Amino acid sequence: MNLTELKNTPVSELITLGENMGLENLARMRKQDIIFAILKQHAKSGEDIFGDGVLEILQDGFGFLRSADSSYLAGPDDIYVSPSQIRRFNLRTGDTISGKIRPPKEGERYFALLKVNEVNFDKPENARNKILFENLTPLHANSRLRMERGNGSTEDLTARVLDLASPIGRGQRGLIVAPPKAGKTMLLQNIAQSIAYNHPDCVLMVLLIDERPEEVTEMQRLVKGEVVASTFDEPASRHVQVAEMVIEKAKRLVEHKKDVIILLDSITRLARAYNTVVPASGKVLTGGVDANALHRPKRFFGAARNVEEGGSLTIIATALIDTGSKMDEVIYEEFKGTGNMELHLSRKIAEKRVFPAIDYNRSGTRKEELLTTQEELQKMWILRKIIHPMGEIDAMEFLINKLAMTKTNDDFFEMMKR
Amino acid sequence: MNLTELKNTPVSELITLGENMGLENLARMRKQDIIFAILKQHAKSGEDIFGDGVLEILQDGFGFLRSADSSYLAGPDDIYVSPSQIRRFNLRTGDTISGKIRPPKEGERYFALLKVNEVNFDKPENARNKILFENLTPLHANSRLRMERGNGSTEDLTARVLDLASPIGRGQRGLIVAPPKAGKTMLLQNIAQSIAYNHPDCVLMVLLIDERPEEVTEMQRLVKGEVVASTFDEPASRHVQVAEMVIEKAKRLVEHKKDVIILLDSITRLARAYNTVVPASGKVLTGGVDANALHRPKRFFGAARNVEEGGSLTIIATALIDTGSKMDEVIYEEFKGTGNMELHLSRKIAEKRVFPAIDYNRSGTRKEELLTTQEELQKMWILRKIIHPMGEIDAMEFLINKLAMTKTNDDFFEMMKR
Numbered sequence: 001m002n003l004t005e006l007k008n009t010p011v012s013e014l015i016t017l018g019e020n021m022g023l024e025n026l027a028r029m030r031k032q033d034i035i036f037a038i039l040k041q042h043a044k045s046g047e048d049i050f051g052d053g054v055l056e057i058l059q060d061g062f063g064f065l066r067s068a069d070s071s072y073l074a075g076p077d078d079i080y081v082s083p084s085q086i087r088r089f090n091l092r093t094g095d096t097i098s099g100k101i102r103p104p105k106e107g108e109r110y111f112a113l114l115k116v117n118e119v120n121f122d123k124p125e126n127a128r129n130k131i132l133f134e135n136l137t138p139l140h141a142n143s144r145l146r147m148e149r150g151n152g153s154t155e156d157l158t159a160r161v162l163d164l165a166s167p168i169g170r171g172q173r174g175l176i177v178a179p180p181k182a183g184k185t186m187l188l189q190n191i192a193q194s195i196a197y198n199h200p201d202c203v204l205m206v207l208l209i210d211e212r213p214e215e216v217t218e219m220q221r222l223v224k225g226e227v228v229a230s231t232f233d234e235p236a237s238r239h240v241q242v243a244e245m246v247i248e249k250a251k252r253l254v255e256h257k258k259d260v261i262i263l264l265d266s267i268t269r270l271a272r273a274y275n276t277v278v279p280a281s282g283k284v285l286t287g288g289v290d291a292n293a294l295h296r297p298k299r300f301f302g303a304a305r306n307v308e309e310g311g312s313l314t315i316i317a318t319a320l321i322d323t324g325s326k327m328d329e330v331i332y333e334e335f336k337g338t339g340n341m342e343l344h345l346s347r348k349i350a351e352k353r354v355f356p357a358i359d360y361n362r363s364g365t366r367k368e369e370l371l372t373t374q375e376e377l378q379k380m381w382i383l384r385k386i387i388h389p390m391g392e393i394d395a396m397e398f399l400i401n402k403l404a405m406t407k408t409n410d411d412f413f414e415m416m417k418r
Numbered sequence: 419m420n421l422t423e424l425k426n427t428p429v430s431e432l433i434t435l436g437e438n439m440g441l442e443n444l445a446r447m448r449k450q451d452i453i454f455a456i457l458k459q460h461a462k463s464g465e466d467i468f469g470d471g472v473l474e475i476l477q478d479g480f481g482f483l484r485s486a487d488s489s490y491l492a493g494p495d496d497i498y499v500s501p502s503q504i505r506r507f508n509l510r511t512g513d514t515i516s517g518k519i520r521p522p523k524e525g526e527r528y529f530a531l532l533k534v535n536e537v538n539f540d541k542p543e544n545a546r547n548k549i550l551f552e553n554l555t556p557l558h559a560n561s562r563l564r565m566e567r568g569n570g571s572t573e574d575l576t577a578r579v580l581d582l583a584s585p586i587g588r589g590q591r592g593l594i595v596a597p598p599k600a601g602k603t604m605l606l607q608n609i610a611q612s613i614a615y616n617h618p619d620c621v622l623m624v625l626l627i628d629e630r631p632e633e634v635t636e637m638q639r640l641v642k643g644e645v646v647a648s649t650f651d652e653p654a655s656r657h658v659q660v661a662e663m664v665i666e667k668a669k670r671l672v673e674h675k676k677d678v679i680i681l682l683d684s685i686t687r688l689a690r691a692y693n694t695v696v697p698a699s700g701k702v703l704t705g706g707v708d709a710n711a712l713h714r715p716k717r718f719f720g721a722a723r724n725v726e727e728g729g730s731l732t733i734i735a736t737a738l739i740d741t742g743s744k745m746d747e748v749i750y751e752e753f754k755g756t757g758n759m760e761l762h763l764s765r766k767i768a769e770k771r772v773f774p775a776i777d778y779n780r781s782g783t784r785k786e787e788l789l790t791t792q793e794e795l796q797k798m799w800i801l802r803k804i805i806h807p808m809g810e811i812d813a814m815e816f817l818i819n820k821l822a823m824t825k826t827n828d829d830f831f832e833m834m835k836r
């Protein structure tokens with residue numbers, strides 16, 4: 001029996017399946033309780049069960065395989081694995097493990113792994129000789145990630161506008177400056193769709209911190225891939241835990257020669273959660289924040305890199321400014337010159353209901369010549385020269401108007417070449 | 419007899435009933451005590467006493483059927499339900515149980531439930547199979563709640579202004595930012611009347627926290643619905659208990675595919691009560707608040723959603739700003755991004771005796787395309803474009819002057835189009 005099959009099924013179908021098996025009252029308790037009871041009954045039946053999850057090390061030394069469909073939330077059905085297994089097969093937090101599951105015997109409040117048959121989509125033995133994450137050297141991004149949809153639809157307009165504004169490559173550490181009511185989500189959704197279509201091989205995971213519960217559903221419906229989020233109901237501990245699990249899973253994927261892309265929703269929310277969770281170091285920085293608090297956001301953000309051996313790790317993050325909270329621009333002043341590429345959004349442009357509201361003159365990337373070719377580089381340079389004089393809002397209007405008349409980016413290339 | 423109808427009777431009628439029943443004193447006791455005495459005297463002869471109430475589950479195992487007449491205050495007349503009944507029918511806190519009761523026996527001082535005949539306005543068997551609230555899928559609000567009644571009276575001006583400014587829908591999570599002496603109570607009263615008029619099907623509850631005793635009675639005599647309040651002369655535990663009972667009752671009602679609307683007089687007062695009642699976690703933010711504390715009010719605020727299966731939970735809570743306290747400031751600080759609808763009251767417009775004192779430029783709703791039609795949305799955009807250059811007080815004066823001339827918002831749009 002497949003645990004993920006039960007998890008993916010709707011709750012009503014789970015209740016009906018349990019009632020067919022029996023168990024009497026099943027509707028009232030949560031989904032995790034339902035799946036736990038159904039799994040226990042099926043194990044009592046005798047048939048072997050196969051389950052998969054993402055491993056995590058707890059402070060007690062034990063391992064837990066959290067599930068992605070629950071946004072890595074601890075639950076009664078969370079498989080728990082002894083440190084003996086971790087010693088037997090070299091494992092750490094973020095690893096994806098699939099195998100047969102032991103029924104919960106006396107003293108077993110959760111399910112446990114009997115035999116492991118898959119580690120990070122690979123055999124257990126082949127995971128021992130892999131190299132850690134930052135043992136691999138950091139290298140400048142060189143392989144361009146093309147996120148032009150190419151269908152000519154209105155959705156592709158923002159993708160190509162950001163592409164000529166500031167190209168994004170594999171392994172880059174992007175940064176988005178998003179004032180309130182600027183279209184941050186309407187940009188993230190398009191970026192996620194472009195990544196999922198143009199580059200299906202790369203693993204796409206979306207991390208949302210301090211989000212509204214209603215937006216999580218639309219994010220997880222629109223994005224083809226893995227969406228994990230922590231709403232504002234959950235404490236800062238949950239935000240930190242989900243962020244750490246996501247970054248560790250990405251690092252483990254990179255170590256396994258996989259290419260993974262992370263679309264972080266907000267650096268500011270993560271930094272606030274980290275400031276809340278960490279103990280005080282005895283020194284209070286400006287704005288009621290801790291020096292040690294700001295370190296772990298840097299640890300999360302700096303993992304974006306183009307590994308010369310196994311692939312890339314791209315982390316696109318968005319910054320919140322002019323929110324009113326002073327810790328927000330404290331975090332901004334911490335990350336002034338950290339991102340490889342920076343895209344700036346403008347509130348005044350968004351006021352006229354013309355989108356995308358970006359500042360083309362400000363938005364740009366460093367060492368762009370590596371990602372693009374010579375012709376693209378000089379074309380971008382002359383475009384910067386010619387749209388440099390006119391105002392940013394008129395610049396955006398002219399850009400969207402001109403890209404509208406052109407089917408693709410090459411049509412624009414030939415248009416400004418004449 | 420029925421306990422609820424006895425509770426609804428005035429105190430003098432209760433004393434007369436106790437006297438003609440042949441019971442002495444009953445004058446200087448509280449309402450609950452005289453109710454208990456009357457119930458005991460009638461129970462000595464039987465006649466199958468009835469009673470209903472909202473279930474509050476205590477950690478010891480058993481529960482109590484509180485009444486909304488006393489705003490769920492603990493009293494001698496509360497029905498006592500044993501854990502056996504809570505186990506036979508799956509009952510959680512907030513369930514509305516109605517049935518016959520039995521007189522207390524030797525060794526017990528509370529009336530006990532004898533035979534349940536209604537749970538959540540439904541048969542117990544049907545209520546046992548309901549899906550839990552947490553398993554329901556949140557969604558963006560799409561069904562509008564039109565405040566305007568079209569009467570043309572000067573009271574409808576506030577409703578029409580608010581319909582133009584920040585449209586609301588079933589399942590919204592609204593926030594009213596009100597400085598002191600701006601007119602929040604009158605606005606809440608008007609919203610309650612508009613809801614009771616236009617949408618009689620929705621369940622309307624008005625929750626007042628730390629309110630003055632006279633305002634409580636004013637709201638109870640004005641609002642056509644359920645009003646539960648806890649005055650300032652009560653411990654913060656009382657505020658916490660009342661808020662939790664209200665939210666649990668709302669969740670149970672929503673589980674039955676019902677639309678529930680909750681108007682919260684102050685999220686700031688609720689946050690203060692939670693901060694007082696919660697144990698200190700050792701990390702204290704600016705102003706003396708505990709980061710652990712604000713997790714509980716947020717869970718109250720985050721329950722507002724539009725359930726995909728059916729029903730919705732609208733929560734319109736007022737936030738107090740510029741009250742002269744840093745703790746209230748940080749409480750509002752932690753709550754900006756949670757709401758999908760905001761309405762900003764202005765003291766500058768209030769001091770000129772121009773009402774409603776609504777800051778039109780700084781107030782709005784998120785994703786208004788779903789609630790309103792295309793023509794309504796474009797007309798609203800035209801009006802916003804017209805208003806935007808004006809100052810807040812001039813804009814509100816002009817808007818109210820133009821709005822009073824006609825009767826309905828549609829005719830106002832037609833006139834402005836010309």
Ligand SMILES: Nc1nc2c(ncn2[C@@H]2O[C@H](COP(=O)(O)OP(=O)(O)OP(=O)(O)O)[C@@H](OP(=O)(O)OP(=O)(O)O)[C@H]2O)c(=O)[nH]1
Nearest residue numbers: 158179180181182183184185186355356782783784785786
């Ligand atoms: N059709 C279209 N709309 C765009 C586009 N780009 C931006 N927008 C609009 O910009 C708004 C999105 O802003 P968000 O980033 O979602 O809001 P933020 O709070 O900054 O981030 P968050 O969603 O919390 O993570 C939406 O309008 P609101 O009604 O929510 O703003 P309004 O609320 O003023 O009515 C979008 O419709 C685009 O390319 N096409």
Ligand SMILES: [Mg+2]
Nearest residue numbers: 184185265266
């Ligand atoms: Mg956001």
